[PDB]
Design a protein around this motif. Sequence first.
Motif, PDB file in Angstrom:
ATOM      1  N   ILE A  88      -2.705 -13.865   7.939  1.00  0.00           N
ATOM      2  CA  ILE A  88      -3.423 -13.138   6.869  1.00  0.00           C
ATOM      3  C   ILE A  88      -4.286 -12.066   7.524  1.00  0.00           C
ATOM      4  O   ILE A  88      -4.365 -10.939   7.029  1.00  0.00           O
ATOM      5  CB  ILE A  88      -4.219 -14.106   5.975  1.00  0.00           C
ATOM      6  CG1 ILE A  88      -3.286 -15.041   5.192  1.00  0.00           C
ATOM      7  CG2 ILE A  88      -5.172 -13.358   5.076  1.00  0.00           C
ATOM      8  CD1 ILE A  88      -3.984 -16.146   4.431  1.00  0.00           C
ATOM      9  N   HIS A  89      -4.961 -12.425   8.595  1.00  0.00           N
ATOM     10  CA  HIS A  89      -5.762 -11.458   9.365  1.00  0.00           C
ATOM     11  C   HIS A  89      -4.851 -10.364   9.940  1.00  0.00           C
ATOM     12  O   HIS A  89      -5.232  -9.192   9.855  1.00  0.00           O
ATOM     13  CB  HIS A  89      -6.574 -12.186  10.405  1.00  0.00           C
ATOM     14  CG  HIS A  89      -7.322 -11.235  11.273  1.00  0.00           C
ATOM     15  ND1 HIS A  89      -8.349 -10.420  10.819  1.00  0.00           N
ATOM     16  CD2 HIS A  89      -7.169 -10.968  12.582  1.00  0.00           C
ATOM     17  CE1 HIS A  89      -8.819  -9.717  11.824  1.00  0.00           C
ATOM     18  NE2 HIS A  89      -8.104 -10.023  12.915  1.00  0.00           N
ATOM     19  N   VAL A 102      -2.651  -3.218   7.666  1.00  0.00           N
ATOM     20  CA  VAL A 102      -2.900  -2.287   6.546  1.00  0.00           C
ATOM     21  C   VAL A 102      -4.038  -1.339   6.870  1.00  0.00           C
ATOM     22  O   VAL A 102      -3.965  -0.174   6.435  1.00  0.00           O
ATOM     23  CB  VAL A 102      -3.150  -3.125   5.276  1.00  0.00           C
ATOM     24  CG1 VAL A 102      -3.877  -2.326   4.200  1.00  0.00           C
ATOM     25  CG2 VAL A 102      -1.827  -3.748   4.805  1.00  0.00           C
ATOM     26  N   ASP A 103      -5.048  -1.812   7.537  1.00  0.00           N
ATOM     27  CA  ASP A 103      -6.227  -0.984   7.855  1.00  0.00           C
ATOM     28  C   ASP A 103      -6.056  -0.135   9.120  1.00  0.00           C
ATOM     29  O   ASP A 103      -6.978   0.636   9.435  1.00  0.00           O
ATOM     30  CB  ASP A 103      -7.440  -1.890   8.000  1.00  0.00           C
ATOM     31  CG  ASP A 103      -7.847  -2.538   6.672  1.00  0.00           C
ATOM     32  OD1 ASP A 103      -7.366  -2.078   5.606  1.00  0.00           O
ATOM     33  OD2 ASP A 103      -8.572  -3.543   6.753  1.00  0.00           O
ATOM     34  N   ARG A 156      -4.050  -7.851   7.334  1.00  0.00           N
ATOM     35  CA  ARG A 156      -5.197  -6.996   6.995  1.00  0.00           C
ATOM     36  C   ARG A 156      -5.362  -5.906   8.065  1.00  0.00           C
ATOM     37  O   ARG A 156      -5.563  -4.723   7.736  1.00  0.00           O
ATOM     38  CB  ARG A 156      -6.432  -7.868   6.860  1.00  0.00           C
ATOM     39  CG  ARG A 156      -7.722  -7.146   6.463  1.00  0.00           C
ATOM     40  CD  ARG A 156      -7.682  -5.918   5.579  1.00  0.00           C
ATOM     41  NE  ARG A 156      -7.146  -6.238   4.315  1.00  0.00           N
ATOM     42  CZ  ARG A 156      -6.809  -5.394   3.354  1.00  0.00           C
ATOM     43  NH1 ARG A 156      -6.918  -4.077   3.447  1.00  0.00           N
ATOM     44  NH2 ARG A 156      -6.350  -5.931   2.255  1.00  0.00           N
ATOM     45  N   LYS A 170      -6.145  -4.692  16.759  1.00  0.00           N
ATOM     46  CA  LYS A 170      -6.167  -3.328  16.186  1.00  0.00           C
ATOM     47  C   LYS A 170      -5.530  -2.334  17.173  1.00  0.00           C
ATOM     48  O   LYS A 170      -4.718  -1.529  16.780  1.00  0.00           O
ATOM     49  CB  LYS A 170      -7.596  -2.948  15.817  1.00  0.00           C
ATOM     50  CG  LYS A 170      -7.643  -1.610  15.069  1.00  0.00           C
ATOM     51  CD  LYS A 170      -8.993  -1.277  14.486  1.00  0.00           C
ATOM     52  CE  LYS A 170      -8.994  -0.006  13.683  1.00  0.00           C
ATOM     53  NZ  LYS A 170      -8.390  -0.188  12.345  1.00  0.00           N
ATOM     54  N   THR A 204       0.845  -1.193   0.000  1.00  0.00           N
ATOM     55  CA  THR A 204       0.000   0.000   0.000  1.00  0.00           C
ATOM     56  C   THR A 204       0.872   1.231   0.000  1.00  0.00           C
ATOM     57  O   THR A 204       2.064   1.159  -0.068  1.00  0.00           O
ATOM     58  CB  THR A 204      -0.967   0.003   1.194  1.00  0.00           C
ATOM     59  OG1 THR A 204      -0.185   0.220   2.375  1.00  0.00           O
ATOM     60  CG2 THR A 204      -1.786  -1.253   1.320  1.00  0.00           C
ATOM     61  N   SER A 241      -2.389 -13.737  -1.507  1.00  0.00           N
ATOM     62  CA  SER A 241      -3.777 -13.615  -1.008  1.00  0.00           C
ATOM     63  C   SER A 241      -4.126 -12.164  -0.673  1.00  0.00           C
ATOM     64  O   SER A 241      -5.268 -11.922  -0.263  1.00  0.00           O
ATOM     65  CB  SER A 241      -4.043 -14.516   0.204  1.00  0.00           C
ATOM     66  OG  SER A 241      -3.182 -14.213   1.282  1.00  0.00           O
ATOM     67  N   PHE A 242      -3.195 -11.224  -0.859  1.00  0.00           N
ATOM     68  CA  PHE A 242      -3.417  -9.819  -0.394  1.00  0.00           C
ATOM     69  C   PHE A 242      -4.415  -9.113  -1.293  1.00  0.00           C
ATOM     70  O   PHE A 242      -4.232  -9.012  -2.517  1.00  0.00           O
ATOM     71  CB  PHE A 242      -2.114  -9.021  -0.386  1.00  0.00           C
ATOM     72  CG  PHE A 242      -2.333  -7.629   0.150  1.00  0.00           C
ATOM     73  CD1 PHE A 242      -2.612  -7.464   1.495  1.00  0.00           C
ATOM     74  CD2 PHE A 242      -2.339  -6.503  -0.657  1.00  0.00           C
ATOM     75  CE1 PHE A 242      -2.838  -6.201   2.021  1.00  0.00           C
ATOM     76  CE2 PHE A 242      -2.571  -5.239  -0.135  1.00  0.00           C
ATOM     77  CZ  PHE A 242      -2.837  -5.098   1.207  1.00  0.00           C
ATOM     78  N   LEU A 243      -5.418  -8.495  -0.696  1.00  0.00           N
ATOM     79  CA  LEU A 243      -6.457  -7.787  -1.450  1.00  0.00           C
ATOM     80  C   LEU A 243      -6.050  -6.319  -1.489  1.00  0.00           C
ATOM     81  O   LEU A 243      -6.199  -5.586  -0.512  1.00  0.00           O
ATOM     82  CB  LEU A 243      -7.810  -8.037  -0.813  1.00  0.00           C
TER      83      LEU A 243
END
Length: 167
Positions: A135-136, A142-143, A139, A108, A11, A165-167
């Motif tokens: 993977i979680h 990144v968020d 995510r 988070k 990103t 697997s990265f969206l």
Amino acid sequence: VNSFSGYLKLTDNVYIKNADIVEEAKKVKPTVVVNAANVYLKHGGGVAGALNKATNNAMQVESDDYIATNGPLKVGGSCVLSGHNLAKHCLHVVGPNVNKGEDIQLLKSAYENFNQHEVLLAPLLSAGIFGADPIHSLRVCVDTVRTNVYLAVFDKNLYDKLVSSFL
Ligand SMILES: Nc1nc2ccc(Cl)cc2s1
């Protein structure tokens, strides 16, 4: 421009590499290396055991004095200590340990600590022996993290799965 080399850009602010965080820290000497800490700063295994071993146990000695003065961290919390021979500073961050039954929603909160630092070398929080799905973890990273984070992924197999697997 910074000294980090060979990372894939995920990103605007998150980068990833298959690397041993110990060897990466020794090469780059980043301002901040993140440790995958527990609330007691007992650096026995995983990333923490490896970082501490690389400091010849000086990280553990400093950490024991920190706990004797301040008491344990919170799950989701952090403290800034010396980076010893690896970095200027070590940001000890406590992600939830699934193998102790801690609330994954605290992941988070853990990553929010990174926002207090402009650039960091870090592992995926709560991955490895902390039992979360990496993977979680990626995510949530990144968020949540808005500062520039260079992630070192120890498992080549896992690295390739995280990228693919990265969206
Ligand atoms: N020298 C290193 N040891 C470890 C141990 C565990 C993990 Cl998850 C990463 C690393 S890098």
